[PDB]
């Protein structure tokens, strides 16, 4: 969706991405146009933008939080069209607008509060991974790996809207060009009927697909509801591992790391060599995900804190498991509910019981 936003736009976009993935993408997409990397803090940024504007070269500027107001006339897309020549005023310098000129604002920090003037002139495109984003990513991966048939049915449902219709239209056009090339000769009957029968078979397949869209949709819904707890657990695992940085400065982890544990557990899994039952494979993959995530986190983690991450994984599995009480009250009392003012009525009770224990 973000790439869709990048492709079709009127106001120039600003790229928000904690990683460099989007910057790499826009790099590869515009190599043919000779996209030049630039940053606002750079002193040569002015001459770079002027040169790119002269040849209509695409530009990307990093460090957008230190935005340069000098780009306001360019962002506004103001045009001083005079004498058959398109013109802009850049400070004291006057430049012509070479067409096919694009600028992509960029940054690396999710939490940047831009002024409203910068807000209005730009289309925000965001790449920050969230609960729902990683949740859906893990779901897509698990349907792609574990149940490729449902994944293919999902892809067919996706294509049936426009892609299958376009393919059918192009096949009809091929029939048209073949027929006008052959002028509908009775001698060409064999090829014509072969093509028309293949077209009829394709149309029948499409009609069966549109007649079964409810059944396929319900099956996809059932499988997604089956596989949802695993993806919720994965999102919780990743966000716990990310927030682990608060305990110790040594506990920094990336999304690439978590994707690595997910891929390792999904494909390179010894436990899933002989298992075939879908529910059995799902239980195995969940258990191995928890185990391998804990092992890989704690291998490079302090010994005094292993129990902390083990407890976090226990709570996450408890939230993900079914047929169990929610246990919010007991856990809340265990975490913080101990520090409630209750000094009143602190009787010694039994002699074996101390004051603090009381």
């Amino acid at each position: 969706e973000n790439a869709i936003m990048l492709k079709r736009f009127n106001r120039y976009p600003l790229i928000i991405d904690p990683s460099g993935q989007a910057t790499e993408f826009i790099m590869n997409e515009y190599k043919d146009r000779k996209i030049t990397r630039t940053s606002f803090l750079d002193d040569a940024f002015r001459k770079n933008l002027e040169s790119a504007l002269r040849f209509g070269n695409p530009l990307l500027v990093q460090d957008v939080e230190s935005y340069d107001p000098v780009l306001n006339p360019v962002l506004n897309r103001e045009v001083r069209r005079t004498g058959g020549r398109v013109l802009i005023t850049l400070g004291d310098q006057d430049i012509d607008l070479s067409p096919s000129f694009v600028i992509f604002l960029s940054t690396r920090d999710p939490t940047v509060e831009f002024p409203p003037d910068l807000c209005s002139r730009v289309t925000f495109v965001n790449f920050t991974v969230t609960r729902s984003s990683l949740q859906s990513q893990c779901l897509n991966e698990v349907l792609k790996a574990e149940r490729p048939d449902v994944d293919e049915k999902r892809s067919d449902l996706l294509k049936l809207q426009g892609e299958f219709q376009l393919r059918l239209r192009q096949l009809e056009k091929s029939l048209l060009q073949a027929l006008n090339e052959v002028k509908g000769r009775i001698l060409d009957d064999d090829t014509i009927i072969t093509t028309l029968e293949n077209l009829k078979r394709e149309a029948a397949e499409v009609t069966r697909k549109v007649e079964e869209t409810d059944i396929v949709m319900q099956e996809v819904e059932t499988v997604s509801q089956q596989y949802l707890p695993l993806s919720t657990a994965c999102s919780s695992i990743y966000f716990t591992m990310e927030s682990l940085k608060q305990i110790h400065f040594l506990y920094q982890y990336s999304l690439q790391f978590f994707l690595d544990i997910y891929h390792n557990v999904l494909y390179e899994n010894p436990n899933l060599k002989g298992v075939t039952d879908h529910t059995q494979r799902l239980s195995i993959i969940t258990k191995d995900l928890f185990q391998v995530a804990f092992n890989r986190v704690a291998r490079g983690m302090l010994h005094q804190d292993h129990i902390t991450f083990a407890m976090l994984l226990a709570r996450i599995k408890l939230k993900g498991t079914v047929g169990e009480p929610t246990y919010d009250a007991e856990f809340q009392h265990f975490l913080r509910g101990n520090e409630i003012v209750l000094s009143a009525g602190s009787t010694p009770r039994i002699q074996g019981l101390t004051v603090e224990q009381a």
């Binding site: 107001p69 103001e78 009809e172 509908g184």
Partner: protein, 1552 residues
């Protein structure tokens, strides 16, 4: 050249300490040695000068900083060794050799000395005088160590016949001799030698008595090996091997470097452990890091260890006096020569700097570690290191110490850490007291140390308080000096019966009590009582100085008293100041502003001059007034020529004494503030060093009769280094009581002529007012009450009292003038009494609380009425502040003196016309009063209160004053004031000094500096221009920095006017300046005042239309009433721009006048319609919510019908009320529909030719265009345009400017944009709008504003109409020429510069309009018309979508109408169509975006603003997507049909 410098450094390693330019100076000036000794204190430990021959050919010896000199046994000759390096090395080697030989001779002497009993004091004194301090201490240590070694060697058997007791007895008799000697009168050098000797001998006694006599008989036992042992073997030919020093298992060779007379650090257990640890670290070739709290004795400890081993030690403080270009080379020098280096505090270093020096130290320490490889102990290849990217040899004796308070990870394995958290203070004191001569040192130490602990704890925490070990040590040396002085006094009339406890108490009180705040003095004395029981202090009588003080005070109109009497605290402070003057130079006089500081030392100086007969001269200099460079002087980077600064010039003049400056007490008083920038050169002068280090190389030494004075109020931005070097006296405000202020004022009134008849009048007045200036009289109680009251500025007692005294002086002058007007029947006693008492009450009323709100003044007046006995205005409704004291002696209302002025029609609401009112008629009286005494004053009030014009008109009313309008920006510095004097004033050298006076004769130049508080506050809490003004006001002059002369101001006055300090951008003024400037709070005019002034304005207005003449008063009344209603609501709390000032009413009247001026014969209907139009456009359109607008409209028609009941409502049900001048020749109220069509066609043309994007027109755009055209229509018009970004306000304003002919000017802002480009742009627009009749629309955006200087420049542009600071020099002459050209083009005469400038200002205010845009400073909100460009409404979004979606094929005849979808209330059909449903869905989408942003903000946040630019982009995307997809579908359908036809043709072919 640099290579030659490096080679010279390599030839003589000690050159690495001096700088590259310093080394260039050395090599260039090798021939003459007189410039060498300036730098000779850098590469040597204590050598400060070289004893040369009469021709500077040979070097007979060296001399230390303290004057101690060493005579070479074999002098060297510079003639035989002409090159600098060779003879310098020879000097070094010879110094070491003679040091060794003197040590040998002294050892031979002290061997005879110690091996004896009952040593004669005379031979010992000759011995100690013969040798140096370091030499005598080393000889004592060597003799004691060898004696102990012999004793233990004789103790092989055990304890039988132990001569260790003999050694102890010898040490005891030596102690007795030293204690006897130090008690007498000795030269300071001999005194220091005695001090060092007794310290070392006490340490020896303590070691031998216990640490050796604990049944220790083996010379190899560790109890003796642990102590520092000295072994001397003179037979060694090598100098470095003569003396052997040992510590545990570590051995070193005495470096024999000359250190002069250094401070011998007291030996204590912590110091011992420190020595042991440091020597152990050095033996293993490791670094030493004695970390610990600052002041625990760390750096000095290392320094004293180095002094013990005779090694040069260097200290690198890290208090930002840090550099690498010098540190690399001194590290090279340390590795080369073999000296020591200690860092004071390594934690202070910057991260990168710390890492770099850590890398260098790591390299050096790795070299040192490799220097002691067990496999490579025989170091054949020299041990080298990498500094400055080159190989450097490391001498094994070099050592590096890093002192902390953690260590970087690089040096953790290389540095041994030691924790000296707590030094043994009791032993430190005991030794110091015993060394001073006291015979009960231990008890005095046990008393003093806990006393210092208590003083550090029990006393309140202060920045200036200091109770560190250094403070204790000093106090002790002062006590020793006091005891010696008392011994001398008693002798001049054995003497061991002195009460030394009293002596120590006297010293500690004499050194502390001056630096204690008033509340802490009883606490300190209680502490002394608790620690010292029943031992009291006795202040010296100083009877002669007391008599001189009384005489001077009675001469200078001052109160004098002793002890409990009035002023006793003050005179005690003077006596403490005099004692501190005796004790040391460089004193600190500190107290709250308004205390008796300046005149305390003034009276002390005059008393000293009259008593001792020594003429006293004081030089008062303000540091912050001038730049540091000008204070000290500058060195030209090219010619290398030096020009002395003010302090440098004064010191040079004193030293030279060409007129006989010596034999005269010179005091350099630094009145002002202290911050670590201008005092960094004063550390060298303030301490015992007493020498000034000029950067060129000149050395200036403080003569003994010169003392440095700082008169600083707070002492808070000052470093501990500055205060710790100062004996300082605190002047608490409690010292200066109000009673002496009153008595001084009365005496000055009774003596100083306020100009013999005037003397008689003043004396009668003073006799009358004497009762009120009592301890509990009217004035004191009024002051006490007003202090509780609230004031716009901080209330300072001195400011209020000074203003009161000034107004009383004006009362006396009024009486004198009245007697002058009536030569017959002069002023009688009873009438004078009545007038004076009433004026006193009126004066207290206007001075106290004169800077507060009206209700606060009323409260104060009620308090005075309660407490006073004098008659008061009997009217119970009108406050006393509205009355005045007539010359006849009765209260009269100020309203009687307010005249009725009729102004001309074309002058209505002119920039300069002022209508007198009660506020004005009072402010002019107070202004004249306070300008009679040339006292500067500040008018403080909310923006638009009329301060500027009241001030200007009152100043120009007087004929003999020349008014100058000076605007103080945030970047205002004194140079603006000096330029002002240069342009208007002249310098005259005819009288005793230089005098600066205006060119015009008999004219009192007044520098009206508006926005006095706007100048920015520097880093250290000072405003340079304000301090400069204070220096002029209090002292009457300033120092012309060009020739460092004291030029006296004459006929110069200062007047200020500024916004309240709470307004953003305003900083409170300094109390010291605030004391001399009374402030009057100019509140907003009262409703009666507005009624009067604007009734005058309306009466002048309506002469144009005679038919409405009698209707002027109801119009004014309704206008004022509506303004009051708008003011009581829409408070600034609800919205930052909800500010209402009479400037709004002035703009209102100007607008009605502009509307009426073309027009002729208007009925009352048109008048009320125009009034309502202006009220709507000025009040209704600045609001946000619709409720505010509807309330405004309802109240407007309500008041209109209230004050015009006879008129109908024909102007009321008219809802639009739209005025324009496009449809006809004049500004008629045209009808909405046809003007709507006309503007629609106009903007159609506009976006057809000018713009490149279609512009829709909705009702909001229409009414906005109406407001915008209105605002450029009026003169001096400026719009405030408040709305969300992208709403089109800039585009709409540009459209209006294009359609009304005005050109548009936009400031093109970039990152490199600075102030000078901005003022160039302002010059450009003003020139193009003032010189030429062309009308410019100024586009101003929030993004274009970067710094506040832009904002204030624009502010003066809008308010004044021009900015005087733009045009100077050639630019001003060009304006002269171009404006004369414009005048001759228009048909006007040029006259002079001032008239043409007035015409230029008129042209600018008539032919310039500034629009300002801001997304949602009170000054900016005022002086502009505020228009709320709110977000697009639902109807606006609906219309935008409908117009922008008309092109699309969005018509579906088969549409089915469902129920609900309420989004747009004014949906065009009741049953919506397909296109209407689509546009409603679009505006619903935008509404849901708004709601989603609001919800996201509610739950957490991180929301980006949603603007109509988003809606336009969405509409464009919808259009492109719809058109593209429909095109694809239609092309596919066409291809389908074409293929179907072709297949039909193929079917026909099949059939054929």
């Amino acid at each position: 050249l640099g290579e030659y410098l490096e080679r010279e450094r390599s030839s003589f390693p000690r050159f690495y300490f001096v700088g590259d330019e310093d080394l260039l100076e050395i090599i260039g000036n090798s021939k003459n040695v007189a410039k060498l000794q300036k730098h000779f204190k850098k590469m040597f430990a204590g050598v400060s000068s070289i004893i040369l021959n009469e021709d500077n050919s040979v070097v007979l010896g060296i001399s230390s900083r303290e004057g101690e000199e060493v005579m070479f046994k074999t002098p060297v000759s510079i003639t035989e060794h002409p090159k600098i390096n060779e003879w310098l090395t020879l000097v070094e080697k010879e110094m070491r050799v003679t040091l060794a030989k003197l040590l040998a001779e002294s050892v031979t002497e002290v061997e005879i000395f110690g091996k004896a009993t009952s040593i004669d004091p005379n031979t010992y004194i000759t011995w100690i005088d013969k040798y140096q301090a370091q030499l005598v201490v080393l000889s004592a240590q060597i003799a004691w160590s060898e004696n102990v070694e012999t004793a233990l060697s004789s103790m092989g058997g055990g304890g039988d016949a132990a001569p260790l007791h003999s050694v102890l007895s010898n040490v005891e008799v030596t102690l007795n001799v030293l204690a006897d000697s130090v008690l007498m009168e000795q030269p300071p050098l001999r005194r220091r030698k005695l001090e060092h000797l007794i310290t070392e001998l006490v340490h020896q006694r303590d070691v031998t008595r216990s640490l050796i006599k604990s049944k220790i008989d083996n010379a190899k036992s560790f109890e003796w090996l642990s102590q520092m042992r000295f072994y001397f073997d003179p037979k060694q030919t090598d100098v470095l091997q003569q003396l052997s020093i040992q510590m545990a298992n570590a051995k070193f060779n005495y470096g024999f470097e000359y250190l002069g007379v250094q401070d011998k650090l007291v030996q204590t257990p912590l110091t011992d452990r420190c020595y042991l640890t440091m020597t152990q670290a050095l033996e293993a070739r490791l670094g030493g890091s004695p970390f610990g709290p600052a002041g625990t004795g760390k750096t000095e400890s290392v320094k004293a260890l180095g002094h013990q081993l005779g090694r040069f030690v260097l200290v690198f403080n890290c208090d930002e006096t840090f550099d690498f270009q010098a540190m690399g080379r001194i590290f090279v020098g340390l590795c080369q020569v073999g000296a020591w280096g200690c860092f004071d505090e390594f934690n202070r270093l910057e991260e990168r700097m710390l890492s770099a020096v850590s890398q260098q130290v790591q390299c050096i320490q790795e070299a040192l570690r490799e220097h002691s490889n067990p496999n490579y102990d025989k170091t054949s290849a020299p041990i080298t290191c990498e500094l400055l990217n080159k190989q450097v040899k490391v001498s094994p004796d070099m050592a590096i110490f890093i002192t902390m308070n953690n260590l970087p990870d690089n040096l953790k394995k290389l540095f041994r850490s030691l924790a000296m958290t707590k030094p043994d203070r009791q032993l430190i004191a005991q030794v110091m007291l015993y060394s001073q001569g006291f015979r009960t040192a231990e008890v005095l130490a046990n008393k003093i140390v806990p006393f210092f602990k208590l003083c550090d704890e029990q006393l309140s925490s202060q920045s200036h308080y200091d109770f560190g070990l250094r403070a204790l040590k000093s106090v002790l040396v002062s006590a020793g000096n006091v005891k010696r002085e008392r011994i001398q006094k008693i002798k001049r009339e054995i003497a061991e019966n002195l009460p030394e406890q009293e002596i120590l108490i006297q010293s500690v009180c004499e050194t502390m009590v001056p630096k204690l705040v008033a509340e802490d003095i009883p606490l300190l004395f209680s502490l002394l009582s608790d620690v010292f029981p029943g031992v009291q202090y006795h202040r010296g009588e100083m009877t002669a100085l007391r008599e001189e003080l009384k005489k001077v005070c009675q001469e200078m109109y001052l109160t004098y008293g002793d002890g409990e009497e009035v002023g006793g605290m003050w005179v005690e402070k003077v006596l403490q100041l005099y004692q501190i003057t005796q004790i040391n130079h460089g004193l600190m006089m500190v107290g709250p502003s308004g205390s008796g500081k300046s005149m305390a030392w003034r009276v002390l100086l005059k008393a000293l001059e009259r008593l001792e007969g020594v003429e006293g001269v004081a030089h008062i200099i303000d540091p912050k007034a001038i730049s540091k460079d000008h204070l000290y002087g500058t060195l030209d980077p090219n010619t290398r020529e030096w020009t002395d600064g003010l302090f440098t010039h004064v010191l040079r003049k004193i030293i030279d004494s060409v007129r006989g400056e010596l034999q005269k007490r010179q005091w350099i008083v630094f009145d002002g503030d202290v911050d670590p920038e201008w005092v960094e050169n004063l550390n060298s002068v303030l301490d015992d060093n007493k020498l000034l280090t000029l950067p060129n190389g000149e050395r200036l030494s403080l003569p003994p009769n010169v003392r440095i004075m700082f008169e600083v109020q707070d002492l808070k931005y000052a470093t501990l280094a500055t205060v710790s070097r100062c004996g300082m006296v605190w002047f608490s405000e409690d010292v200066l009581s109000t009673d002496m202020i009153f008595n001084n004022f009365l005496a000055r009134l009774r003596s100083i002529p306020l100009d013999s008849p005037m003397l008689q009048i003043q004396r009668d007045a003073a006799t009358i007012m004497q009762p009120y200036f009592t301890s509990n009289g009217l004035v004191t109680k009024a002051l006490e009450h007003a202090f509780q009251l609230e004031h716009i500025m901080d209330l300072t007692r001195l400011r209020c009292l000074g203003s009161l005294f000034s107004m009383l002086h004006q009362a006396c002058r009024n009486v004198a003038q009245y007697n002058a007007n009536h030569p017959d029947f002069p002023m009688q006693i009873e009438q004078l009494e009545r007038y004076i008492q009433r004026y006193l009450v009126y004066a207290i009323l206007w001075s106290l609380s004169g800077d507060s709100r009206l209700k606060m003044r009323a409260e104060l007046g009620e308090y005075i009425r309660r407490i006073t006995t004098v008659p008061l205005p009997t009217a119970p409704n009108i406050p006393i502040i509205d009355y005045e004291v007539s010359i006849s002696g009765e209260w009269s209302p100020w309203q009687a003196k307010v005249p009725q002025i009729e102004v001309e029609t074309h002058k209505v609401a002119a920039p300069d016309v002022v209508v007198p009112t009660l506020d004005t008629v009072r402010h002019e009286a107070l202004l004249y009063t306070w300008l009679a005494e040339h006292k500067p004053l500040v008018l403080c009030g909310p923006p638009g209160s009329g301060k500027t014009m009241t001030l200007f008109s009152a100043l120009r009313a007087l004929p003999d004053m020349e008014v100058v309008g000076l605007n103080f920006s945030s970047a205002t510095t004194p140079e603006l004031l000096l330029k002002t004097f240069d342009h208007y004033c002249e310098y005259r050298r005819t009288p005793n000094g230089v005098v600066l006076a205006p060119v015009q004769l008999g004219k009192w130049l007044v520098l009206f500096c508006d926005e006095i508080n706007l100048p920015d506050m520097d880093k250290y809490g000072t405003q340079r221009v304000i301090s400069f003004i204070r220096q002029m006001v209090e002292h009457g002059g300033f120092y012309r920095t060009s020739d460092q002369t004291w030029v006296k101001l004459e006929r110069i006055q200062f007047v200020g006017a500024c916004n309240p300090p709470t307004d953003p951008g305003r900083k409170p003024l300094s109390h010291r300046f605030l004391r001399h400037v009374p402030v009057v709070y100019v509140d907003y005019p009262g409703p009666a005042s507005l009624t009067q002034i604007y009734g005058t304005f309306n009466r002048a207005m309506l002469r144009l239309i005679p038919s409405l003449r009698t209707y002027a008063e109801p119009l004014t009344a309704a206008m004022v009433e509506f303004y009051t209603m708008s003011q009581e609501r829409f408070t600034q709390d609800t919205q930052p721009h909800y500010i209402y000032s009479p400037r709004e009413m002035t703009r209102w009247v100007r607008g009605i006048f502009e509307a009426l001026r073309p027009l002729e014969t208007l009925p009352v209907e048109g008048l009320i319609r125009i009034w309502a139009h202006e009220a709507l456009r000025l009040f209704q359109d600045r609001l946000v919510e619709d409720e505010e607008r509807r309330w405004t409209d309802e109240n407007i028609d309500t008041v209109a019908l209230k004050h015009f009941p006879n008129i109908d409502r024909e102007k009321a049900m008219s809802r639009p009320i739209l005025y324009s001048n496009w449809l006809s020749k004049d500004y008629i109220p045209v009808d909405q529909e046809e003007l709507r069509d006309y503007v629609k066609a106009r903007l159609k043309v506009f976006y057809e030719e000018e713009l490149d994007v279609p512009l829709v027109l909705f009702n909001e755009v229409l009414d906005h265009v109406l407001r915008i055209d209105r605002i450029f229509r009026q003169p001096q018009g400026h719009l405030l345009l408040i709305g969300v970004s992208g709403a089109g306000k800039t585009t709409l304003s540009r459209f209006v400017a294009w359609m009304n002919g005005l050109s548009v000017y936009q400031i093109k802002v970039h990152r490199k944009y600075t102030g000078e480009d901005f003022d160039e742009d302002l010059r450009t627009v003003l020139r193009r709008s003032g010189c030429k009749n062309e009308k410019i629309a100024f586009i101003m955006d929030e993004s274009n504003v970067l710094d506040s200087g832009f904002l204030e420049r624009m502010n003066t542009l809008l308010a004044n109409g021009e900015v005087p600071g733009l045009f100077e020099g050639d630019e001003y002459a060009t304006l002269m020429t171009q404006c004369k050209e414009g005048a001759q083009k228009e048909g006007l005469m040029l006259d002079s510069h001032e008239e043409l400038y007035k015409w230029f200002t008129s042209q600018v205010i008539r032919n310039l309009h500034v629009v300002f845009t801001m997304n949602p400073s009170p000054a900016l909100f005022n002086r502009c018309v505020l228009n709320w460009f709110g977000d697009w409404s639902t109807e606006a979004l609906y219309q935008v979508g409908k117009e922008f979606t008309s092109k699309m094929d969005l018509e579906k005849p088969n549409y089915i109408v469902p129920d609900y979808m309420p989004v747009v209330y004014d949906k065009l059909p009741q049953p919506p169509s397909h296109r209407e449903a689509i546009v409603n869905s679009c505006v619903f989408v935008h509404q849901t975006l708004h709601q989603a942003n609001a919800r996201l903000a509610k739950r957490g946040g991180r929301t980006m603003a949603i603007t109509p630019r988003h809606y336009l982009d969405f509409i464009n995307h919808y259009a492109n997507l719809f058109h593209e997809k429909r095109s694809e579908l239609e092309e596919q359908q066409m291809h389908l049909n074409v293929g179907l036809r072709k297949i039909k043709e193929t079917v026909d072919q099949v059939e054929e």
